[PDB]
Design an enzyme around this catalytic site. Structure first.
Site, mmCIF file in Angstrom:
data_model
loop_
_atom_site.group_PDB
_atom_site.id
_atom_site.type_symbol
_atom_site.label_atom_id
_atom_site.label_comp_id
_atom_site.label_asym_id
_atom_site.label_seq_id
_atom_site.Cartn_x
_atom_site.Cartn_y
_atom_site.Cartn_z
ATOM 1 N N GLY A 1 -14.821 -18.587 11.809
ATOM 2 C CA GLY A 1 -14.921 -20.006 11.534
ATOM 3 C C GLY A 1 -15.535 -20.274 10.177
ATOM 4 N N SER A 2 -15.749 -21.563 9.901
ATOM 5 C CA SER A 2 -16.309 -21.958 8.614
ATOM 6 C C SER A 2 -17.777 -21.571 8.491
ATOM 7 C CB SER A 2 -16.134 -23.463 8.402
ATOM 8 O OG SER A 2 -17.052 -24.206 9.185
ATOM 9 N N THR B 1 -15.937 -25.259 12.447
ATOM 10 C CA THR B 1 -15.917 -24.449 13.657
ATOM 11 C C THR B 1 -16.648 -23.129 13.456
ATOM 12 O OG1 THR B 1 -14.489 -23.091 15.081
ATOM 13 C CG2 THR B 1 -13.614 -23.740 12.933
ATOM 14 N N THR B 2 -17.272 -22.637 14.521
ATOM 15 C CA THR B 2 -17.871 -21.311 14.508
ATOM 16 C C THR B 2 -17.830 -20.754 15.920
ATOM 17 O OG1 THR B 2 -19.366 -22.054 12.751
ATOM 18 C CG2 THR B 2 -19.816 -19.922 13.760
#
Lengths: 222, 4, 215, 4, 215, 215, 222, 4, 4, 215, 222, 4, 215, 222, 4
Positions: free
Chosen positions: A140-141, A1-2
């Site tokens: 996020g990642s 996710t970002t």
């Protein structure tokens, strides 16, 4: 996710990718991660999808409940405080793996100058909040890649269109460097979801404009 | 009540 | 003297039930049919308790709405604890009588409510539908023909006794009940059926065009 | 009282 | 006697609401319009209960403010437990009727107040707006055209019945409501609308310059 | 009988207010000015509720001291839970009205206190100072210019109605206030101001030689 | 265990296998895993059999209880939320081995277009829920094989009968590749159970139609 | 007192 | 109580 | 009627305090001096509350002994919570006034007591001693010079006031105190001083030969 | 992070850096760690940024609450005690990770000597407090470097201006030896925050004076 | 009563 | 009339104590001697509270038995918490007075008992024994000569002040006690001693041939 | 830390050092570890400084509270029991590192013989107390060295002056063999704090006398 | 009751 958020002259824009995974297996291709919490504020929560959805719902209900009870909406500091309280309450479960990291974008109608009334707030795991002064933020990642892309692209942000294009480009770079983040799905026609907040409120960006911008970016990098 |  | 207070409370309750509408729950071949003079399109004085158990009431609305909700809760809890077929109308009528007696005795304000619990046989079985009328003081009576409650009871009850018809079809039973209630048009009429031919849930609401068709 |  | 006490309590409520202002909630093409006699400005006699549910009241501000806050909490909890579209005006009106009956029965001093709950159709849906009136004793009624509360109800209600027409415009309905309310000024009035054309939240206050141009 | 009970309770509340001393809070150019005639040099009827919210009372000292401490706790908890700028004088006035209504209804003896909650604009923001006056039973009034509480209100109120003028400076407002409080010397006088000129905490006390200089 | 669901024009179909194992040992040969929760929704719960039966029982009771109390059935989002809360309240017991994964097929009567009124909802471990938009979903140990089969076969789904055939074939593939899933037992005459929901309601599929579909599939693969 |  |  | 009961309780407290031996608390050069006519060697109407806070009372022994113990508990808890110098006589006087008001309104039998809280300056500091009288009803008053409690207050009060001299010494002050109190002997008097010259704990009892030398 | 405090003839000064890290990654660049708790005391908390902000807010609220309730501000010893009570109550969470070390600078209005009314109080993790008599103190990760710099520089402190210069120099040395402390950022124009408390109250030092002091120090070191 |  | 009610309660108490046997506690050279007219041989109305603290009572038996047990529990807890020498007779007397006041006020039925607490010096010390007399309303009296409880106290007191000789021996004290109690035989008389000569536990019973050969 | 106490004909004297360390790092130089609990008793607590200060404060509060409530001071055995109960109630927190071991010196005003009314009570970890009969005691890390020095020096104790000198010399020996105990500071002018209790009460010894004694000891050792 |  970002999830990326950035301030442009006259408002703020928040965009998020659409992929959710269970480890390495793709389990969702059209997840919506950016919520319009109220008419002048949007929130984007990264981490476990269940906790993100629950936190968005609970936070929106909290703000709405206060506005109805008192007849006047919370000040931006009040909203930040409530979100921070929620994150700090989550900490105990977040250690177990229900980790949720929010990012808040808003338009402060009580500011002196409406040309700089956009606000971006980042939260840490422990509950501390920081009002961003550099003009962009990501959670996020793929947040590191998105932020390093925005650091270079932010000199081009002049209006809502420039901010939206830079946000979609940063999401594209994040997906390009991170496998947990999904890029524009050209075969399926699935694109990141964006919200633009200005003096007139918070509005969802139509998928047509985001599709156009994503196609432009892909054609640029080909 | 009912006494029956 | 306690007896003077008891008579005052009893007369208050009969007066409160007296100034209300009239409900008729009559057993017919397909099960049980509930007809009530209910002008409102929102307040529902006939409801479903459980799969084959239906509920009708007369008197002050919020009292029997709370009683209806408590009976639904009890039926759901009992059906979950043991089984759906272990819930019968007799247990619900007994619990209603218990709580009405307790409210009459302990509570200061008596409930000006009359309740009717109707049970029909399950799918694939044959049994006479059983109607239990529970009064304000907690008295419970098993009535095997038809219950009439609220408003002026004697004339409608006597009209039904004169025009009683065993194993009547639904259309004739509805005409009989509306004629007895008159002694009224399609509107301001709330009707329902505990239908013994349905597999699991016997309760079914007949509203709008179907009421016009049957009349 | 509500009786309808 | 308890009968004497109950009669005196109903009369107490009648006087308490009588020496209070009047509020009019009337259905029109775009939804519902609330107009209240509010010589104050900070205190609000009209509020929002939920996305399509609005609240108006008449009485003493403490009691119906408490009731309004309780209804807001109930609607928010219900919408969070199941869904935003699972909250209806009928549920809130029923809850208000039950709590007002309980307050009347148990409290040493009853809550002398009248409430009105209005609901409008969801966005992209056509449905007749629903208005419910809840009285001091827990009685609930459904009105299809208008609601008038507090003050000299007879002249204003008759004037509305004479001058209110369905499918009225916003300007037309506001003029009709103010004219009926005379039976006053541009200010000292609280104006709100349940707007069925809004996407999610119907309720909208019309105060100041917008109302000034509208009147 | 309930009529007599309510009448005697309200009458004893009014008798309590008459026995209390007089205090006047008026909106002047810098904000709100509180002046009270109190012999005690340690027990104060005027205090700070929150950053821009001030408090005045007339009546039994322990009762409105309890009310003042409750309001302070409410304001602090509310400001910490959300934000300092989310605390308003209107919310404090509403909570005071709720508590006073509950005290009148449920307490064996009501509170003979009359309250004034004053609010001023935040720093750098223009806004008319707000004054809420709250009575024994919970009646809450918006007073755009001044609030007179305790003792012979009629003579002092009329004196202000004629002498008081909008946009008074500190010295002029003090002179008008003491002259209309005659209907007193520098000592035995308690004076404070909510001053909108201050950045955060508007409440300030002028005492000793400075107060005498301004008188 | 494997339970599949797929939308077809005008409704949804949900099928489930019949085998229950305690380790490598086959303990149940005719377990029923697809329940008609109410007249327009069916639920199918994979995982432990005991928790699955208890979950279906509680969910059906809860929906019926709301319908009887309020006089109107829950909206579809309300049913989804109740099931999601039921799943989330089971995290503590599932960490000890009592895992139950539900899959919800339903027919939204309040939808605009009746042809696209079918809904498939998949729940993750933590309680998150996702309304599937691709038109098919599976839960259980053979869920991946069934999903990969349905990905290739879903273009043949034109109506209820072809949708039922594709569901049965996906179950056959899952049983082929996973030993915890039971295939069609031609010796004992035991076949997967199926429920079809359309505008008229939710009905269990008769065992003869499933038997003939399974025989056609088997004689195709021979 | 308060009726508004 | 004291009235000041 | 409530008024009849309230005046009955007020006169009950007044006569209970009247039929009690009197006590005098006067400010002298070194601090405060309490002199009470206490025939009992064991019971004490004078006691220390905190470092510079002393206590005296007149009325029923158990009632004001409970009050004294509550005050000591409050002062010690407060001094531990923040600091010893954060405990002042005014806070204790306010607490006593509040609890006596609560006793008056809610207790079955109102306390028939009158308290005096005396506070001297800290060591190495200049400040006039503060004397607070607290009455049975919760009324709290400030006395700049002396306090007289219990018995017949008029004769001792008049003799003291007409004989009172500020800045008096301890020997003198004891002389005038016994002179006004007689209107006594070496024994049967319990005396104590809040001594501002002591470094930390001001309270000091004068019993035995030193009192006789002074008296 | 580093916060320094030192007494000068006639008052006290407290300064702090602006860097916030999450491990080795710089997450904040304009954090404010010195808060004016009340008109005569400033507090500065090192450790977790979230806990620092919470403690500052709650301590200020407690002091204001007492002053409003009782009409008189707490004595300096009472403020010390309340802060120590907060630190002790944080002990379990500090062992769990959410840790805060406060440092208090104050002016004693009730002191007999106005010149020597400045007070500096340090706290250890167990809640104990010590009133500094050496005239300076530091907290944070770079506290030892700052303290050893102030040891050599304290003989130059004769007024508010020289005291502020010495405090800025101490922060500069702490950042020069410790990477968790931020130095004066000339590219972004971000400088340490400072609060000066004298007989006239506690006032924030404007960024201009700190900027020119830091520039003079950097020119001296070059 | 005790008053000493 | 609350005054009449409280007076009737007081009269009830004095009547209840009047119809009871009398107890004489006289301080003699070796300590304190208790002599009670006790017809029974099982019931004990003279008892030990603590090492140097003895207890005597008159009135309704179960009431003062409960009081005696409570006092013993208090003394044992107090001695274990701090030290055996921190328990004094003054503390026990004050606790008895407080609890008697609480029972008299709050409890519907008063305690018609009268207590005497006697305290003697520790081993190796010289001190005049202290005698406290605690009445039904919580009134404590520091009586240094003799205590007489129950029955008609006037003749016993008159004989005692006719015959009270200080520092009399045990035999002479017993003679005086028996003779003054008469104005009897070896039996029907229960006698005990708080003996200061004992090292730790002063209380000692005089029974069997000891009392006979003593008188 | 090291606190010594010793009886002399007609009273008792209690002395303590001033150093506080965190590990092997010196954090405090003027810590006062000997408190005048009440007019005739002093207490000195070794272990953690925070717990020592809190214990002394609470114990003094308890003694004063009892004295005011009852109108008479506790007997010496009562004070010992209260301190022992307070030590016993800290057994749980002492295991995790918040240890506090007190030493109680007093003048028993109820004792028959005035010249032998000095009392020393030592406490053990579990809350057990022992009234010392050898005439001296010590607590803290350097307590063994202090006791073994007082063993040889106790024959020289004859009055207040010799007792104070022997206490200071015992503290000097403890500091000579232990690094957590601070010796006399002839550069900073910091010397051990002492309290002398006799028939007239408990008085702190002025720093001048202790400075003279410490310098005499240091010159004798050179 | 009993007064012995």
């Amino acid at each position: 996710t970002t999830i990326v958020a950035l301030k442009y002259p006259g408002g703020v824009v928040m965009a998020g990718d659409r992929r959710s995974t269970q480890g390495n297996m793709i389990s969702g291709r059209d997840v919506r991660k950016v919520y319009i919490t109220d008419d002048y504020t949007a929130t984007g929560i990264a981490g476990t999808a269940a906790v993100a959805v629950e936190f968005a719902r609970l936070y929106a209900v909290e703000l709405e409940h206060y506005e109805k009870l008192e007849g006047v909406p919370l000040t931006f500091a009040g909203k930040i405080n409530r979100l921070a309280i929620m994150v700090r309450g989550n900490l105990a479960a977040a250690m177990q793996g229900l980790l949720a990291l929010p990012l808040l974008a808003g338009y402060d109608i009580h500011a002196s100058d409406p040309q700089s009334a956009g606000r971006i707030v980042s939260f840490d795991a422990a509950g501390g909040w920081n009002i961003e002064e550099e003009g962009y933020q990501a959670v996020g990642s793929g947040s590191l890649f998105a932020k390093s892309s925005m650091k270079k692209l932010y000199s081009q942000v002049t209006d809502g269109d420039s901010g939206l294009r830079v946000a979609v480009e940063a999401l594209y770079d994040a997906a390009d460097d991170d496998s947990a983040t999904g890029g524009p799905d050209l075969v399926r026609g699935i694109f990141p979801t964006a919200v633009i907040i200005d003096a007139d409120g918070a509005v969802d960006v139509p998928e047509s404009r985001i599709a156009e911008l994503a196609r432009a970016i892909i054609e640029s990098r080909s | 009540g009912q006494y029956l | 003297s306690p007896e003077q207070a008891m008579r005052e409370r009893s007369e208050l309750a009969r007066k409160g039930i007296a100034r209300a509408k009239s409900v008729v729950a009559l057993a017919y071949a397909g099960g049980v049919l509930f007809v009530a003079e209910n002008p409102s399109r929102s307040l529902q004085k006939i409801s479903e308790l459980y799969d084959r158990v239906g509920f009708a009431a007369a008197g002050k609305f919020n009292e029997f709405d709370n009683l209806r909700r408590g009976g639904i809760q009890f039926a759901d809890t009992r059906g979950y604890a043991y089984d759906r077929r272990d819930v019968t109308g007799r247990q619900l009528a007994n619990v209603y009588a218990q709580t009405l007696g307790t409210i009459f005795t302990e509570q200061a304000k008596p409930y000006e409510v009359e309740l009717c619990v109707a049970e029909v046989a399950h799918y694939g079985e044959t049994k006479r539908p059983e109607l239990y009328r529970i009064t304000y003081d907690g008295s419970i009576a098993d009535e095997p023909h038809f219950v009439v409650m609220g408003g002026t009871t004697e004339p409608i009850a006597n009209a039904l006794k004169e025009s009683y018809a065993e194993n009547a079809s639904l259309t004739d039973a509805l005409r009989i009940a509306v004629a007895a209630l008159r002694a009224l048009g399609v509107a301001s009429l709330e009707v329902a059926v505990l239908d013994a031919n349905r597999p699991r849930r016997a309760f079914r609401r007949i509203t709008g065009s179907a009421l016009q068709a049957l009349l």
